[PDB]
């Protein structure tokens, strides 16, 4: 359940996310009819005095049975065209992403671990 002004963690190898900054990134917009963002939802991120698109891959809110609940809200940065900003992901990613309506093949390619 990510909302406007939520603080999120960039699970990626991109320099933009990796480099330490005095402020953690905050969500600015949720691309949904509702304002709530769940796994598989794009959002608009404010990073280092800049705006970038990003994708939610995990959160701390309970879901339906037999699905993984994480300890932090994890996000991945996405370019305007939709190509991933980073080249690697190390943290486990849920397998529900494969079938959900949307474009997730590109992110799945870069992710090693699936839980």
């Amino acid at each position: 359940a990510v909302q406007k002004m939520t603080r999120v963690r960039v699970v990626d190898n991109s320099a933009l996310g990796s480099t330490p900054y005095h402020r953690p990134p905050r969500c600015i917009h949720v691309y949904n009819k509702s304002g709530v963002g769940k796994v598989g939802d794009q959002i608009l991120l404010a990073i280092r005095g800049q705006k970038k698109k990003a994708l939610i891959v995990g959160h701390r809110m309970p879901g339906s049975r037999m699905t993984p609940k994480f300890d932090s809200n994890n996000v991945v940065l996405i370019e305007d065209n939709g190509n991933p900003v980073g080249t690697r992901i190390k943290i486990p990613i849920p397998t529900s992403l494969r079938r959900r309506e949307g474009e997730y093949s590109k992110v799945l390619a870069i992710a090693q671990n699936f839980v």
């Binding site: 037999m66 609940k69 994480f70 486990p92 397998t95």
Partner: protein, 217 residues
């Protein structure tokens, strides 16, 4: 004699018939697949079929932190940390896409809920993925692991020190001053343990179920 929690009925105004009907289906699945005995705190490995992919299975290993539900809806939640990222999954025992349940290590802990492990140090939740099963002895009683974990800085997910939770597996002396402990005790509600109308005696119900389950065997 270990009677699984789900078999015990909850109190209420429901008819007994609804429970008899549910039990018959529960026993039938147990013949097809065996459900091992375990308690909160034991480490388990569960194998389940993956729906998205075609005929490919999955395995998850973690410590059981909670047992809930009644009848065919019973659940259990087990936890582990992978690459320094904590994950929990809630499993239903009677879900038909569970291939096997393996008790890697059977043991009992001081409390019947370990949800406070979220606030403990990471080491107390990590378990080796490839750890092999340990031996068990039939002519014994289940072991009770008495470890007391250490906590991270005070801001926590819940106020575990407060008397309602009744936590007995945290080293409070290290994390809290004696002044704070007295501050917590203002929420005690001492009278609850001594009023005889809030107690649900299930000894007879437990006994009757035992023979019927054994008799059906």
């Amino acid at each position: 004699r270990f009677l699984s929690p789900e078999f015990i009925p909850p109190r209420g105004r429901t008819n007994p018939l609804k429970f008899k009907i549910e039990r018959k289906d529960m026993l039938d699945r147990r013949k097809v697949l065996p459900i091992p005995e375990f308690y909160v705190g034991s480490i388990l490995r569960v194998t389940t079929a993956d729906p998205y992919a075609s005929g490919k299975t999955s395995q998850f290993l973690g410590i059981c932190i909670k047992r809930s539900g009644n009848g065919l809806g019973a659940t259990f939640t087990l936890r582990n940390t992978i690459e320094g990222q904590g994950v929990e999954i809630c499993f239903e025992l009677y879900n038909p896409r569970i291939q096997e349940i393996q008790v890697v290590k059977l043991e009992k802990r001081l409390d019947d809920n370990l949800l406070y492990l979220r606030d403990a140090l990471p080491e107390y939740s990590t378990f080796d993925v490839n750890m092999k099963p340990v031996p068990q002895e039939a002519c014994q009683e289940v072991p009770v692991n008495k470890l007391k974990v250490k906590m991270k800085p005070k801001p926590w997910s819940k106020r575990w020190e407060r008397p309602n939770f009744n936590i007995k597996g945290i080293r409070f002396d290290l994390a809290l001053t004696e002044e704070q402990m007295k501050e917590a005790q203002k929420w005690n509600k001492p009278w609850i343990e001594f009023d005889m109308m809030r107690e649900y005696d299930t000894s007879k119900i437990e006994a009757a179920l035992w023979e019927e389950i054994e008799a059906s065997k």
